[PDB]
Amino acid sequence: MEVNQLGLIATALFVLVPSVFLIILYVQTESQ
Amino acid sequence: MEVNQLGLIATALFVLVPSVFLIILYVQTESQQ
Amino acid sequence: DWRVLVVLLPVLLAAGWAVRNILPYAVKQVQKLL
Amino acid sequence: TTGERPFSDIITSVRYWVIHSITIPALFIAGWLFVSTGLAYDVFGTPRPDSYYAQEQRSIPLVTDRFEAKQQVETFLEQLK
Amino acid sequence: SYPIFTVRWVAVHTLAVPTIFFLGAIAAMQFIQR
Amino acid sequence: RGWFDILDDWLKRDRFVFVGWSGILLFPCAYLALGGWLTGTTFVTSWYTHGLASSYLEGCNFLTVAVSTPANSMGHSLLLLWGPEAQGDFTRWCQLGGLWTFIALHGAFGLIGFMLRQFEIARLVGVRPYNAIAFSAPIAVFVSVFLIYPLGQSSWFFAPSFGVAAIFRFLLFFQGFHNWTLNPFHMMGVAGVLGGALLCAIHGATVENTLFQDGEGASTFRAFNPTQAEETYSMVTANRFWSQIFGIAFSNKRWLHFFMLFVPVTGLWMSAIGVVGLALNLRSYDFISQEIRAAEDPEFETFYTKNLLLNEGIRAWMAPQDQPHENFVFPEEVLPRGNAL
Amino acid sequence: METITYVFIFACIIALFFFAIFFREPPRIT
Amino acid sequence: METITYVFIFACIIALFFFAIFFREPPRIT
Amino acid sequence: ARRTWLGDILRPLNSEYGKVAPGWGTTPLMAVFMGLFLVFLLIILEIYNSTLILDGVNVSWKALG
Amino acid sequence: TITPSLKGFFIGLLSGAVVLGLTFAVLIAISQIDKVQR
Amino acid sequence: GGRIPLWIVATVAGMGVIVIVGLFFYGAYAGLGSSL
Amino acid sequence: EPNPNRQPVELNRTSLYLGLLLILVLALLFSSYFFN
Amino acid sequence: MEPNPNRQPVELNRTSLYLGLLLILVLALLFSSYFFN
Amino acid sequence: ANLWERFCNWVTSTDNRLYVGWFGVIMIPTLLAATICFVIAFIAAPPVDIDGIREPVSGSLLYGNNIITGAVVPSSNAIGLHFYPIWEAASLDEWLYNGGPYQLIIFHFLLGASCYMGRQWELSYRLGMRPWICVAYSAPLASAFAVFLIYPIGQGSFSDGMPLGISGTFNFMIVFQAEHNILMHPFHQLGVAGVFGGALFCAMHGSLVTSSLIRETTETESANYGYKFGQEEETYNIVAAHGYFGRLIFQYASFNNSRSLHFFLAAWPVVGVWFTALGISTMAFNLNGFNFNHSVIDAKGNVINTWADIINRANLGMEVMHERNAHNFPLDLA
Amino acid sequence: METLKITVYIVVTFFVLLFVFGFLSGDPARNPKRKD
Numbered sequence A: 001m002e003v004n005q006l007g008l009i010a011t012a013l014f015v016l017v018p019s020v021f022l023i024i025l026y027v028q029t030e031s032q
Numbered sequence B: 001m002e003v004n005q006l007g008l009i010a011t012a013l014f015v016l017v018p019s020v021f022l023i024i025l026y027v028q029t030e031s032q033q
Numbered sequence C: 001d002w003r004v005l006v007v008l009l010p011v012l013l014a015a016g017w018a019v020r021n022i023l024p025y026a027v028k029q030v031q032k033l034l
Numbered sequence D: 001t002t003g004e005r006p007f008s009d010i011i012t013s014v015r016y017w018v019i020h021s022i023t024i025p026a027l028f029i030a031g032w033l034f035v036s037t038g039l040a041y042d043v044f045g046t047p048r049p050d051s052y053y054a055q056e057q058r059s060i061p062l063v064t065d066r067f068e069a070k071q072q073v074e075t076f077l078e079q080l081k
Numbered sequence E: 001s002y003p004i005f006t007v008r009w010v011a012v013h014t015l016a017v018p019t020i021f022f023l024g025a026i027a028a029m030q031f032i033q034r
Numbered sequence F: 001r002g003w004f005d006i007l008d009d010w011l012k013r014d015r016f017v018f019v020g021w022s023g024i025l026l027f028p029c030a031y032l033a034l035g036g037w038l039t040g041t042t043f044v045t046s047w048y049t050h051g052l053a054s055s056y057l058e059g060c061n062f063l064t065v066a067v068s069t070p071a072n073s074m075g076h077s078l079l080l081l082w083g084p085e086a087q088g089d090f091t092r093w094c095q096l097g098g099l100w101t102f103i104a105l106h107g108a109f110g111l112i113g114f115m116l117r118q119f120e121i122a123r124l125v126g127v128r129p130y131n132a133i134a135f136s137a138p139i140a141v142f143v144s145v146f147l148i149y150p151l152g153q154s155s156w157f158f159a160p161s162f163g164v165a166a167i168f169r170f171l172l173f174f175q176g177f178h179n180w181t182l183n184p185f186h187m188m189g190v191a192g193v194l195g196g197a198l199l200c201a202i203h204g205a206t207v208e209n210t211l212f213q214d215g216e217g218a219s220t221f222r223a224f225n226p227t228q229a230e231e232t233y234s235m236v237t238a239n240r241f242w243s244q245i246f247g248i249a250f251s252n253k254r255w256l257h258f259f260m261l262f263v264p265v266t267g268l269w270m271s272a273i274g275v276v277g278l279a280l281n282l283r284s285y286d287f288i289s290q291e292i293r294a295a296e297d298p299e300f301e302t303f304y305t306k307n308l309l310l311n312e313g314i315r316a317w318m319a320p321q322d323q324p325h326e327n328f329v330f331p332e333e334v335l336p337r338g339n340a341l
Numbered sequence G, H: 001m002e003t004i005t006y007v008f009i010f011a012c013i014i015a016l017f018f019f020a021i022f023f024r025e026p027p028r029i030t
Numbered sequence I: 001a002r003r004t005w006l007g008d009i010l011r012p013l014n015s016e017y018g019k020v021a022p023g024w025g026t027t028p029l030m031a032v033f034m035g036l037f038l039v040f041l042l043i044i045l046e047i048y049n050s051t052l053i054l055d056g057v058n059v060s061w062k063a064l065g
Numbered sequence J: 001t002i003t004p005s006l007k008g009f010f011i012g013l014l015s016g017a018v019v020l021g022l023t024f025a026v027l028i029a030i031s032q033i034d035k036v037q038r
Numbered sequence K: 001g002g003r004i005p006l007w008i009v010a011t012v013a014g015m016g017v018i019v020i021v022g023l024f025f026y027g028a029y030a031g032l033g034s035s036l
Numbered sequence L: 001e002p003n004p005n006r007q008p009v010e011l012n013r014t015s016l017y018l019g020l021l022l023i024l025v026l027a028l029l030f031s032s033y034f035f036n
Numbered sequence M: 001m002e003p004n005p006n007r008q009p010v011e012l013n014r015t016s017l018y019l020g021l022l023l024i025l026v027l028a029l030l031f032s033s034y035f036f037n
Numbered sequence N: 001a002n003l004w005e006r007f008c009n010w011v012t013s014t015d016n017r018l019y020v021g022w023f024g025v026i027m028i029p030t031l032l033a034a035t036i037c038f039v040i041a042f043i044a045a046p047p048v049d050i051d052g053i054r055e056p057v058s059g060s061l062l063y064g065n066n067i068i069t070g071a072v073v074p075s076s077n078a079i080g081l082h083f084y085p086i087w088e089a090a091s092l093d094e095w096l097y098n099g100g101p102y103q104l105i106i107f108h109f110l111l112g113a114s115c116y117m118g119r120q121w122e123l124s125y126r127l128g129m130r131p132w133i134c135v136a137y138s139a140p141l142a143s144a145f146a147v148f149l150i151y152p153i154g155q156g157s158f159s160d161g162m163p164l165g166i167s168g169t170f171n172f173m174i175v176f177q178a179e180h181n182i183l184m185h186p187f188h189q190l191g192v193a194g195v196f197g198g199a200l201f202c203a204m205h206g207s208l209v210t211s212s213l214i215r216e217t218t219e220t221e222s223a224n225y226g227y228k229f230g231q232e233e234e235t236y237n238i239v240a241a242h243g244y245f246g247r248l249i250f251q252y253a254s255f256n257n258s259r260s261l262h263f264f265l266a267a268w269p270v271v272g273v274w275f276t277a278l279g280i281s282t283m284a285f286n287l288n289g290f291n292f293n294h295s296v297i298d299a300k301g302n303v304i305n306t307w308a309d310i311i312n313r314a315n316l317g318m319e320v321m322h323e324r325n326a327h328n329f330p331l332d333l334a
Numbered sequence O: 001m002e003t004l005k006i007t008v009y010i011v012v013t014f015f016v017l018l019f020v021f022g023f024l025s026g027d028p029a030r031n032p033k034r035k036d
């Protein structure tokens, strides 16, 4: 299927970036 | 240039994944002292 | 062949010469080994 | 400090130089002869200045077989004889 | 009272004996002519 | 109080050269690799394996002498003296390259022995075994270059030959055939060797110029005592200096000296990996995008295309004499050449 | 896109320099 | 690539479910 | 620590931690198997390398038929 | 059956054996004459 | 025991090397390996 | 001279679970449109 | 059943963060040309 | 309290996060000019006619280069050693085509890096240090002078200066080997010994100190926390280091004096690298590597090749292909 | 271009004279121990 191959990177970053934000904040919460 | 299209995602992830890991361990180190 | 004696002869004389100058002291060391 | 005789004290000793003023030139002469007699060429199979090519040859006598290689260089050496 | 023949003695002569012999062979070689 | 223990006692005596259990592997193999190299470089030719002279006897000098690899027709034969090739004949064994495998294999077991020595002495003295660990880098390089590389190739012939100019030729082969300078594992190795030399120099210089005045004399060497507890130079002044000159400095002596182990060991380890790739002709030879553009666009030129022309000259000009078993006959008209030269 | 990527990484390194120098953990005596 | 991506995200959510049920903050009665 | 039915069954298999045979025990015999295995690996290597050549052992693809 | 290279093998095996045992015959002897006291 | 003074050992040993090495450089110009 | 308005920040586990579900499901929804 | 006594805190100080990020960015800068090829 | 005297005190202040100093007064502008021009040219310079034959080589990223292939390209061979500032060009377009940026960058860098070395002297004086760290850095600095300045002077062209690029560097070392046989040159051989040796002794010393760290920590924490910045006692056992190393080799090949050990650490790579910089600087005047091409012949006069001859066949392949369009006459005399 | 050339001449001369006069201003005396 002739899909947009920037869609992979946009989907990837759409997930990675905000999730990493969330994780960083949770882990530093647990260690204090 | 006719460059490998996956190069981008490979480079991005190669940077992001190991960096995010180090940041996670630094910030939680600091929340201790 | 014969060149092997030419070659080896000096080293035997060297070993001979050194054998004779050191023998008396070499036997004192072996005595000390019980 | 380990109980061997110090090197400094050995190579100034009269006894030492009495032996090694013989043993050192005998070995130097020994090795000289190994070459001057031609024995080193025959032991090691090294070509002499005159035995690299046969007279009108400009072919390297290159080994080209694994288990027949011994026989090859033997043939190349008779191609000089 | 020092030993004469040691492990040290042996390591020394292991190297030094053929050095001199090799130096003498390499000396003869400077006179080889084609 | 059995014999095994008695031998342990004797192997581990404090003497001018410590022996150890590891001495049993190390000393014979080191002496034989070394003697093989001095025997071959003094007396043994490469005429029948390479078409080359390679000893003092033959008229070579220290730079051009070598113990050359076996003929390509030997494959990866162990070339044992008693094996089917030499058939026990010392002379033929010499003429077929037997000393190459002798040196390389005895060298390998010597290296093992030397690392076992570092382990053995470190245990007896009571120190951590980081000098042995460090020595894994030399080992990795040696095996990768002298054993794995040619085992991936057609024969031992294409390993490095044990000599000065022969190694120089090995460098240039790798440029022309593998484009090894383009390889990121070689690059990481370069950064580790040069980074290490930098560290070595910058650390030695820093200590020598942050010294405390512990004596009255102008030779500052006299004023150290190996059992003194006090540091002999100021980490504090050193740190402020480099912080102000460079922006960052070391503050932890332990990390500093670990880094000094880490940098050159890793660089060597990276380059080993890349030579393992080259055992298989698995090269970073090209950048595909550049070639597609340059094939289509004859005005497009980079230093990358310039250097491949050089590799191409190298291959065609050195191959016939460097690979005599291939009987390459390149007539004049097929040789690549620029204008006039 | 490859040009953007190369420059981006270089730019990150340069910013990292900035923090390593001016926002270092400050060395403290004894 | 697009199928792998849709399947991967779906599979992450199922794994979220498991942790959110079995590894929840236990509710306790302060 | 938690006891389980399977734990009680396996119990004696993890019960002799630290028990040793005295002195050298079977070490001499181990050394024999070690030395035999070395020679055997030698042979296997030298067969593959073609410096051990044996009748009816054709180290080649042409030994599939 | 028993080819040249197998004879060569056995030749190598016995030479290695000679060498290692002679080496250990010497090492075992010296270690007995020159013992540490305690 | 210490009869030969060490400085004398060093000088004679020193000149012995210079002699042999000098021979090797002489031989770079004469005979085999000389280009002639 | 340390700043008195610094505050610590928190994200409990439940908030992480909720936040991750949001992101993951937003991704599953928009990704079809990103690939188009 | 007790809480597991083997658990341990993990640390990465600020300098190790800088060193590690440099490593990763320089690695990325080196390999990206080969990834794009 | 006077204006000049307060300026002087700020320039030489040991309280600035980064020391400025009088050497800094020249370093900062010149390194900034060289850095800024370098960064912009690497990304966006148009192609440059390095060899003066109207055959521009593309060196920047936007013109189809990657990090590995990109460079700031040396100025035109038509310029040779003439000075080519911006204001000598009819326009920036001309200056770009002929390789002007290279000259701007290298001159500012060499100047700024020279002042870097002086700055190292200066702060050491302001801090009451011994003064010779700058002598250590003269070895790298000399190396940079050799490939960016000395080698062009002797060859008559910054076109043969080393390119500011990764693959440009490789193009330079390949052509150098074919025109000078640098591998057979003893000063290059001393560089390799200085660099191999330097990495060896780095590893040795780091492994030897690390092996003899005094136990100050538990297995759950970095050993590095056993040292506290500024502590007065030493943090390893040097006698234990000496006792391991002396036995690994023999006693007297090991250092028991840390001052001699650290000065050896400094001098070995510094001196090797001086020589290899000298090597480039003297091959700039075409005093080249040893030449043993056809030095072994047989009784008839056949040539008996050595490894030197094989090297020569590689050099020849480099020679005939480099700058394939630039030579009209049969000898490449510069 | 000439505007540029004049400007660079000015900027360079300015920095070079800061350097010359800065070191002429009792530089040996700016050290931590002994001042002349």
Ligand code: CLA
Pocket (backbone or CB within 6 Å): F024, F025, F028, F029, F032, F078, F079, F080, F081, F082, F098, F101, F102, F103, F105, F106, F109, I035, I038, J012, J013, J014, J015, J016, J017, J019, J020
């Ligand atoms: C002790 C250290 C040591 C080690 C590790 C090696 C290792 C090696 N040597 Mg070197 N060698 C050594 C010392 C050593 N050598 C010494 C001291 C000498 C001087 C004599 C030599 C001279 C030498 C030569 C001349 C050659 C080698 C070669 C080799 C290689 C093959 C050896 C082989 O096939 O073994 C085979 C044998 C064994 C592994 C022995 C195993 C012993 C078993 C366990 C016991 C068997 C007992 C016996 C069968 C029972 C009695 C029989 C009955 C009649 C009563 C190998 C790399 C060869 C080489 O490098 O090829 C290029 C080669 O040509 N070595």
Ligand code: CLA
Pocket (backbone or CB within 6 Å): F034, F137, F138, F139, F140, F141, F142, F144, F145, F170, F171, F172, F174, F175, F179, F180, F181, F186, F189, F190, F193, F194, F267, F268, F271, F272, F273, F275, N173, N195, N196
């Ligand atoms: C800036 C220049 C530069 C630098 C710094 C390096 C650095 C390196 N190169 Mg690269 N190289 C370069 C340019 C450079 N290269 C160029 C332009 C080319 C052309 C393509 C090459 C081609 C090249 C090749 C072909 C190879 C390298 C290799 C290496 C590595 C060698 C590591 C080493 O110590 O091996 C030294 C060897 C050892 C450490 C092995 C063990 C040594 C034991 C301990 C010896 C003991 C000696 C014993 C005591 C006897 C002493 C006495 C005797 C001398 C008489 C290192 C990372 C090698 C590599 O990557 O290896 C993985 C390799 O094979 N280089």
Ligand code: CLA
Pocket (backbone or CB within 6 Å): F171, F172, F194, N113, N139, N140, N141, N142, N143, N144, N146, N147, N172, N173, N174, N176, N177, N182, N183, N188, N190, N191, N192, N195, N196, N273, N276, N277, N279, N280
């Ligand atoms: C194993 C193989 C091997 C090895 C180990 C070496 C080793 C070496 N070679 Mg040889 N070389 C080889 C193979 C090898 N080469 C081959 C095969 C060839 C032929 C193709 C050559 C051709 C060759 C040439 C042509 C040259 C070398 C040079 C060198 C030296 C390079 C290191 C140096 O110059 O440091 C010195 C340090 C520097 C050059 C750097 C100075 C850094 C400045 C002062 C500061 C830079 C600041 C920076 C821009 C910013 C950093 C700050 C940060 C915030 C970004 C070194 C001795 C070079 C040499 O001798 O140059 C003097 C040289 O020109 N080699």
Ligand SMILES: C=Cc1c(C)c2cc3nc(c4c5[nH]c(cc6nc(cc1[nH]2)C(C)=C6CC)c(C)c5C(=O)[C@@H]4C(=O)OC)[C@@H](CCC(=O)OC/C=C(\C)CCC[C@H](C)CCC[C@H](C)CCCC(C)C)[C@@H]3C
Pocket (backbone or CB within 6 Å): F029, F030, F033, F034, F037, F038, F103, F104, F107, F108, F109, F110, F111, F114, F131, F134, F135, F137, F138, F142, F161, F162, F163, F164, F167, F193, F264, F265, F268, N196, N197, N199, N200, N203, N204, N207, N248, N249
């Ligand atoms: C060409 C470069 C090079 C050489 C020559 C070299 C040499 C050595 N390194 C040693 C050590 C080390 N090297 C180390 C790190 C490094 N070493 C490096 C590079 C080298 N290291 C680099 C770059 C590093 C940085 C990681 C460490 C950490 C150590 C040590 O601890 C050790 C030491 O004590 O240093 C002071 C010594 C081990 C002695 C030994 O094994 O004796 C036994 C000799 C044996 C086993 C024989 C091996 C024979 C070889 C492998 C084949 C035959 C070689 C021929 C005879 C000579 C051929 C020469 C021609 C090719 C020109 C030895 C002096």
Ligand SMILES: CC(C)=CCC/C(C)=C/CC/C(C)=C/CC/C(C)=C/CC/C(C)=C/CC/C(C)=C/CC/C(C)=C/CC/C(C)=C/CC/C(C)=C/CC1=CC(=O)C(C)=C(C)C1=O
Pocket (backbone or CB within 6 Å): F187, F188, F189, F191, F192, F195, F196, F198, F199, F202, F203, F204, F206, F207, F235, F238, F239, F242, F243, F246, F248, F249, F250, F251, F256, F262, F263, F266, F267, F270, G006, G007, G010, M026, M027, M029, M030, N038, N039, N040, N042, N043, N067, N165, N166
């Ligand atoms: C505009 C554009 C985009 C620009 C493009 C420009 C350009 C071309 C960029 C190219 C960049 C490129 C890709 C580079 C590649 C580099 C590459 C090969 C990376 C190596 C990768 C890698 C992991 C290699 C493995 C080997 C490795 C670990 C090497 C590490 C080398 C290294 C960091 C060594 C240290 C060097 C260094 C300068 C340290 C200084 C130390 C220092 C502060 C000491 C001072 C000091 C000394 C003392 O003694 C004491 C006591 C104190 C207190 C003290 O302080």
Ligand SMILES: CCCCCCCCCCCCCCCC(=O)OC[C@H](COP(=O)(O)OC[C@@H](O)CO)OC(=O)CCCCCCCCCCCCCCC
Pocket (backbone or CB within 6 Å): D005, D006, D007, D008, D009, E011, E012, F017, N248, N249, N250, N251, N252, N253, N254, N255, N256
């Ligand atoms: C380059 C590194 C060393 C720099 C030099 C300074 C280091 C200082 C040494 C320690 C403190 C000072 C000692 C002062 C004295 C000094 O520094 O050294 C001089 C020393 C002389 O020792 P003697 O026992 O003769 O005399 C004691 C002296 O200390 C008197 O000053 O030289 C020797 O060891 C000669 C032996 C070398 C010949 C051995 C060859 C056989 C070796 C074969 C084994 C191979 C190696 C092992 C294989 C793995």
Ligand SMILES: CCCCCCCCCCCCCCCC(=O)OC[C@H](COP(=O)(O)OC[C@@H](O)CO)OC(=O)CCCCCCCCCCCCCCC
Pocket (backbone or CB within 6 Å): F245, F246, F247, F248, F249, F250, F251, F252, F253, F255, F256, G010, G013, G016, G017, G020, G021, M013, M015, M016, M018, M019, M022, M026, N018, N224
């Ligand atoms: C006036 C101009 C001065 C020049 C300005 C230059 C600024 C750049 C300097 C380095 C900043 C980054 C270092 C971060 C990392 C950092 O902050 O390290 C800080 C670290 C501090 O070490 P300490 O000993 O304090 O810490 C050890 C323990 O305390 C923690 O475990 O320093 C080192 O480890 C020294 C060795 C690092 C040496 C790495 C330097 C390599 C830099 C060059 C890489 C460039 C490639 C670029 C290609 C594009």
Ligand SMILES: CC1=C(/C=C/C(C)=C/C=C/C(C)=C/C=C/C=C(C)/C=C/C=C(C)/C=C/C2=C(C)CCCC2(C)C)C(C)(C)CCC1
Pocket (backbone or CB within 6 Å): E014, E015, E018, E019, E020, E022, E023, E026, F031, F032, F034, F035, F036, F038, F039, K017, K021
């Ligand atoms: C192989 C073999 C073997 C063995 C062998 C051997 C072990 C030998 C040895 C050998 C040796 C052991 C030799 C030696 C040699 C030496 C040499 C030849 C030296 C030289 C040197 C020189 C020349 C030096 C000089 C100098 C210079 C040049 C500069 C600086 C200074 C000096 C003085 C150092 C056997 C029998 C088992 C059998 C099989 C085979």
Ligand code: OEY
Pocket (backbone or CB within 6 Å): N051, N077, N155, N159, N160, N175, N179, N322, N323, N326, N332, N333, N334
């Ligand atoms: O080596 Mn060959 O020589 Ca010095 O010039 Mn003549 O050719 Mn051209 O310009 Mn660059 O390069």
Ligand SMILES: [Cl-]
Pocket (backbone or CB within 6 Å): F306, N171, N175, N321, N322, N323, N324
């Ligand atoms: Cl070119």
Ligand SMILES: [Cl-]
Pocket (backbone or CB within 6 Å): N326, N327, N328, N329
């Ligand atoms: Cl011309």
